[PDB]
């Protein structure tokens, strides 16, 4: 449903008629795994036969199509592919069938499943770990660089939970070098770093009093005000939304010829989208983006003032793990986009001749099926033609040398930090690892440390909807940012949900 | 200041006055300061009239 429509147009002239071809996606239907023998016979699958015959324990996927047409002058179940089904999962045959029949089915009651089967091999997915998204982190740079403190953040949608884009602020210059401490923010789809006040004005707050209201919340802390003053001075060349936006889009990484008319619109788009998308992507909410930018810059300078230790990257509380779910999600998304593009291209090349497409020769189930099979079989995580620059070794053969090894192999983790440049921070055991990952277990050699095994009582969050949290908070005096004032609200308590500020509360203890 | 007018803080081009002075058959050589003085005097007279 992420791409819930394909739309074509045809203002046919020879007699101007506007014909719009549409494809509407519908429900998905899933079946228990089955064989289609070359003899044409079919029957329910059971894993043992697969292990014996070098098969793939997979279930076909059926998607509901819909062909609707719009003409003006002025769909059924389709087999799209077979997804491998993890043993003992809800969709595996063996989740049922008692204990006795397992023996008939040639299955050890001890085996806990949790792995896929391909071409007779038993492949398992090793959980990868990545830095949490939608969080600010401040990092000090090295001595030989005008960059001193950087407060980066990566934005990813709550829905899907897929990486969207990032944005960085670079505390340029040194102490008593380059006049003041110039600050410039890097924006998506731009060809140069930009002064902060410029983007502030472009975002809606043209006057500097509002800017200093949002970024600062301790007036007596004169030092931060005066050391951010240099940025204020250099942004006086811009005084209204329009010139700021045009200045922004002028380096909008587009071609030459958009000129000012569409340049400000391009800037308005790139500020409505692609920037802090995890907050929102539509118009009428740049107040929230302003508030977030102010908070983030405030924190960045606080770390620049040494009033708080620079953020720890190894803090495990900021780490996130991705089990089979999210990973298969990403791979399926890529393959689904490929399939949709194929269907669209076939639509184009088959309606020019004006033939009612069968919807069947158009859909090549080999796309998703082949892609998933290859990705699990080889581990080169991605499209086959892009083997290079593709995360390798995500899926591994299930090592069945001894039952304990099998157990351990399943609760494995990993860090894709590469081995180019030795370093030590990622490898060393960290205090936050207490009771989440084993302290004693780890490989030897170059991988020492980068491979971690879940503690005996570990549990991974699968994600829950946040809406009820919002509903509850509002009941309990959650104050939206719109009613926020520095001098008044210098004692209230900010609230973040899933890494995004949502409002204010002045008595959070009872909350 | 690149252009000699900017070096002089005036508006009449010293370069054009100097160019015409070379093609004037008035003297063998032309100094670098006489055009500036002439430009300033002409500017003052023009401002007085205007």
């Amino acid at each position: 449903w992420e791409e819930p429509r394909l739309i074509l147009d045809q203002p046919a002239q020879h007699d101007n008629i506007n014909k719009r071809y549409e494809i509407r996606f519908g429900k998905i239907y899933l079946s228990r795994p089955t064989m289609t023998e070359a003899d044409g016979t079919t029957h329910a699958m059971f894993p043992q036969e697969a292990r014996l015959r070098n098969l793939t324990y997979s279930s076909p996927v059926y998607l509901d199509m819909e062909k609707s047409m719009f003409t003006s002058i002025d769909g059924n179940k389709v087999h799209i592919g077979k997804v491998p089904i993890m043993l003992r999962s809800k969709f595996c045959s063996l989740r049922t069938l008692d204990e006795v029949d397992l023996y008939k089915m040639k299955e050890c009651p001890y085996d806990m499943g949790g792995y896929f089967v391909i071409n007779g091999s038993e492949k398992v997915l090793i959980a990868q770990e990545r830095s949490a998204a939608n969080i600010v982190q401040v990092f000090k740079k090295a001595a030989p660089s005008p960059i001193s403190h950087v407060a980066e953040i990566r934005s990813a949608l709550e829905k899907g939970s897929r990486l969207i884009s990032t944005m960085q602020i670079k505390l340029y210059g040194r102490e008593d070098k380059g006049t003041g401490r110039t600050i410039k923010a890097t924006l998506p789809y731009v060809k140069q770093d930009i002064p902060i006040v410029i983007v502030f004005r472009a975002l809606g707050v043209v006057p500097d009093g509002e800017i200093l209201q949002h970024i600062c919340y301790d007036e007596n802390d004169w030092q931060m005000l005066e050391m951010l003053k240099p940025c204020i001075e250099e942004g006086f060349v811009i005084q209204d939304k329009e010139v700021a936006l045009d200045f922004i889009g002028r380096r909008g990484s587009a071609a030459l010829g958009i000129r000012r008319e569409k340049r400000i619109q391009y800037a308005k788009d790139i500020l409505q989208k692609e920037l802090l998308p995890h907050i929102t992507q539509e118009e009428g909410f740049e107040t929230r983006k302003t508030f977030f930018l102010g908070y983030m810059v405030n924190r960045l300078l606080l770390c620049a003032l040494e009033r708080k230790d620079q953020d720890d990257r190894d803090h495990f509380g900021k780490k996130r793990l991705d089990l089979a779910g999210p990973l298969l999600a990403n791979l399926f998304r890529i393959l689904f986009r490929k399939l949709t593009r194929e269907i669209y291209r076939y639509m184009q090349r088959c309606i020019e001749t004006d033939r009612d497409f069968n919807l069947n020769l158009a859909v090549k189930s080999t796309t998703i099926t082949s892609g998933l099979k290859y990705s699990l079989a080889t581990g080169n995580w991605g499209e086959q033609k892009k083997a290079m620059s593709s995360r390798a070794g995500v899926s591994q053969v299930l090592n069945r040398y001894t039952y304990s090894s099998t157990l351990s192999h399943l609760r494995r983790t990993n860090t894709p930090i590469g081995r180019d440049g030795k370093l030590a921070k990622p490898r060393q055991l960290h205090n936050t690892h207490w009771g989440l990952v084993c302290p004693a277990e780890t490989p030897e050699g170059q991988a020492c440390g980068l491979v971690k095994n879940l503690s005996l009582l570990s549990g991974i969050s699968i994600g829950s909807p946040s809406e009820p949290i919002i509903n509850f908070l509002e009941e309990w005096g959650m104050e939206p940012l719109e009613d926020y004032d520095p001098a008044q609200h210098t004692k209230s308590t900010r609230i973040f949900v899933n890494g995004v500020w949502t409002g204010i509360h002045r008595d959070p203890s009872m909350l | 200041a690149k252009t000699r007018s900017s070096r002089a803080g005036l508006q009449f081009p010293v370069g054009r006055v100097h160019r015409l002075l070379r093609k004037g058959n008035y003297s063998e050589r032309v100094g670098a300061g006489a055009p500036v003085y002439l430009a300033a005097v002409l500017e003052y007279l023009t401002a007085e009239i205007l």
């Binding site: - | 200041a1 000699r4 070096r7 002089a8 803080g9 005036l10 508006q11 009449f12 081009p13 054009r16 006055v17 015409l20 002075l21 004037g24 008035y26 003297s27 063998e28 050589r29 032309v30 100094g31 300061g33 006489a34 500036v36 003085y37 002439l38 430009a39 300033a40 005097v41 002409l42 500017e43 003052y44 007279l45 023009t46 401002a47 007085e48 009239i49 205007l50």
Partner: protein
């Protein structure tokens, strides 16, 4: 073709004295004629004064004395002051 004039320079001088004052084309031509005739007069005076002292080159002092000779007391004095100030500024900077 490339018949140079003093249109834009007179326009700039006018903008700095009376910024909101226009002009016609014939007034511009009259200004061009006045400026050209004054340029010719001062250059000729410099040439004659160089010839009288048998000096083959022109400095700023020749233009200064030519302006003194041409224009009367107060106007010549004011032109001398402006020329001296402009020349000194062009010299120091």
């Amino acid at each position: 073709s490339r018949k140079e004039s003093y249109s834009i320079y007179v326009y700039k001088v006018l903008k700095q004295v009376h910024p909101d004052t226009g002009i016609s084309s014939k007034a511009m031509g009259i200004m061009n004629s006045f400026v050209n005739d004054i340029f010719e007069r001062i250059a000729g005076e410099a040439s004659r004064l160089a010839h009288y002292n048998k000096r083959s080159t022109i400095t700023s002092r020749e233009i200064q004395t030519a302006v003194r000779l041409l224009l009367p007391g107060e106007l010549a004095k004011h032109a001398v002051s402006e020329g001296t100030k402009a020349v000194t500024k062009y010299t120091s900077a």
